[PDB]
Write a protein that binds this ligand. Structure first.
Ligand SMILES: *[C@@H]1O[C@H](CO)[C@@H](O[C@@H]2O[C@H](CO)[C@@H](O)[C@H](O)[C@H]2NC(C)=O)[C@H](O)[C@H]1NC(C)=O
Ligand SMILES: *[C@@H]1O[C@H](CO)[C@@H](O[C@@H]2O[C@H](CO)[C@@H](O)[C@H](O)[C@H]2NC(C)=O)[C@H](O)[C@H]1NC(C)=O
Ligand SMILES: CC(=O)N[C@@H]1[C@@H](O)[C@H](O)[C@@H](CO)O[C@H]1O
Ligand SMILES: CC(=O)N[C@@H]1[C@@H](O)[C@H](O)[C@@H](CO)O[C@H]1O
Ligand SMILES: CC(=O)N[C@@H]1[C@@H](O)[C@H](O)[C@@H](CO)O[C@H]1O
Ligand SMILES: CC(=O)N[C@@H]1[C@@H](O)[C@H](O)[C@@H](CO)O[C@H]1O
Ligand code: NA
Ligand code: NA
Lengths: 266, 266
């Protein structure tokens, strides 16, 4: 089956996009990125935002652990940095510490008593105080024997305006390169040329990281690659890169109904 | 000040984008569109999704009423239709009835004991059972003496693939035409030509509805129009349309920090 990852958490409620456990139990995925954590440039404690899934999300603990015991990695995505004009000391250091204590220590945090597998950073502005490359270095330097995987979700334009610094730390394990919404590098009908060139650029410029092609599971989004096109044209070309890792599915909501991941070649 | 509307509800928590009351109290807006209600093609009761603002959102009642007593209209946006392959009878009729009972009757619904001012529909796929134009007609035909405003948020491409049928009912009071993210009709630096042509097309083809230009409040989104450009170039041209209504701000989160609406001409 290879490496198929998926985004979950912003697809509504359990009744719209299914529970996290449902996603894991489906067997389609070996890694889930939870969307998303809101962080504060002024050092306020982060706010978890899993939409209509839960407000008290501590009961997700058992679902996270179920996933992990099925060998599925669970990463939490930082999706929003609330800016401040205030000059505040130690914001990045303090966030790294908050994350370590609340998600990577088995202690009672927002997702219950878990050790998550890592942190993803979305392609969004950082703060005047909070800096993503600094955060990545701090997390990798964490006082723990646990493996904390670090990743980013850049758009397919290289370099990514928001994440290039974090990428150039050379400390990201995975990149979920987004080939959806309107960008010059998406697939369009009968035209993979820009996507191929972007994949060449990403894989060659970030040889230290595993590169996922993040694709939409629905034909209602720009960048959609029909499964036969993905299997017979796209994958044969992009898999020539030694650091091509697989496909990231945007997102569990669309995939739950479309069963796009089911149609990807073995 | 004219007509300035804003989207609120998907900007995170109260600490990231402020409470609904805060938005109303700011005095920047005369209409707020709440994002968003999830509806079900199989006829399941809708799920309210105001992200990390609340799960039990009934306590928003007092904030809604505060807004309304300040002459601010509150509309709820349908943002997501969860599809089904099942053929289910009366889905649209039943949704109209659910909305009437739960948001337009002063009874104890998901937002408490309110009479909302109306419903907006996002530019998203409808269902195999649930149909937007049918929903608009049903809501307008509601057994009530209350005014229910009906609107849609089409993208700037005319016709809108998802909402054109709803628009052609001629029963929409407002259109929030979205000139952001990547589309051929957005403003780009020193180039309003496509936006002007789109505004001509929207205003001339939908003379029966008031047309808002929906614009991003942050320079970090495609389509951003610096306030001086908006005031001295854009508004003088587009305001020549008799049905040009004003500016819809995407969104309260960005506007809270950027104070974009504050910079729009009187
Ligand atoms: C920081 O990154 C380094 C390098 O990827 C990680 O170090 C590896 O850790 C694994 C398991 O602990 C070992 O098998 C490797 O031999 C290590 N490699 C090197 C070069 O030291 C380290 O674990 C990361 N830190 C965290 C907190 O995950
Ligand atoms: C359906 O649309 C019609 C037309 O806009 C609305 O009828 C208007 O109602 C207002 C206030 O009740 C009156 O001042 C107008 O004279 C009416 N116009 C016409 C042509 O009848 C009607 O209110 C809408 N239905 C709902 C539930 O809002
Ligand atoms: C495979 C896996 O990740 N197992 C985790 C374990 O590491 C952790 O000690 C525990 C308590 O938080 O949750 C487990 O089930
Ligand atoms: C607060 C903010 O917007 N910071 C941005 C940062 O996100 C971006 O990666 C960088 C690129 O050089 O430019 C900064 O201005
Ligand atoms: C101006 C306004 O909309 N006022 C509303 C009123 O119509 C409604 O009867 C009441 C109870 O639900 O909430 C009010 O304050
Ligand atoms: C379930 C679904 O996707 N329905 C779409 C509808 O949203 C769209 O407005 C219409 C345009 O003709 O095409 C239908 O296939
Ligand atoms: Na879709
Ligand atoms: Na921004």
């Amino acid at each position: 089956g290879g490496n198929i990852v998926v985004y979950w958490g912003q697809g509504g409620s359990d009744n719209s996009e299914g529970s996290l456990k449902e996603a894991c139990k489906s067997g389609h995925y070996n890694m889930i990125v939870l969307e998303e954590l809101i962080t504060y440039d002024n050092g306020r404690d982060p706010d978890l935002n899993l939409g209509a899934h839960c407000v008290n999300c501590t009961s997700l603990q058992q679902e996270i652990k179920y996933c992990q015991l099925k060998l599925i990695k669970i990463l939490l995505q930082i999706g929003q940095v609330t800016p401040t004009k205030e000059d505040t000391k130690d914001t990045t250091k303090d966030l790294s510490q908050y994350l370590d204590s609340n998600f990577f220590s088995g202690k009672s945090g927002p997702l219950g008593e878990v050790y998550l597998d890592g942190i993803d950073i979305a392609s969004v502005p950082e703060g005047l105080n909070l800096k993503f490359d600094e955060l990545v270095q701090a997390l990798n330097d964490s006082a723990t024997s646990r493996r904390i995987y670090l990743s980013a979700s850049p758009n397919c334009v290289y370099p990514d305006y928001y994440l290039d610094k974090a990428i150039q730390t050379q400390k990201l394990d995975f990149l979920f390169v987004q080939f959806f919404y309107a960008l010059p590098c998406i697939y369009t009908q009968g035209l993979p040329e820009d996507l191929f060139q972007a994949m060449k650029t990403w894989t060659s410029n970030v040889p230290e990281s595993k590169i996922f092609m993040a694709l939409p599971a629905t034909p209602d989004l720009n960048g959609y690659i029909p499964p036969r096109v993905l299997n017979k044209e796209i994958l044969p070309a992009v898999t020539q890169a030694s650091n091509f890792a697989g496909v990231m599915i945007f997102d569990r909501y669309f995939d739950r109904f479309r069963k796009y991941s089911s149609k990807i070649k073995r």
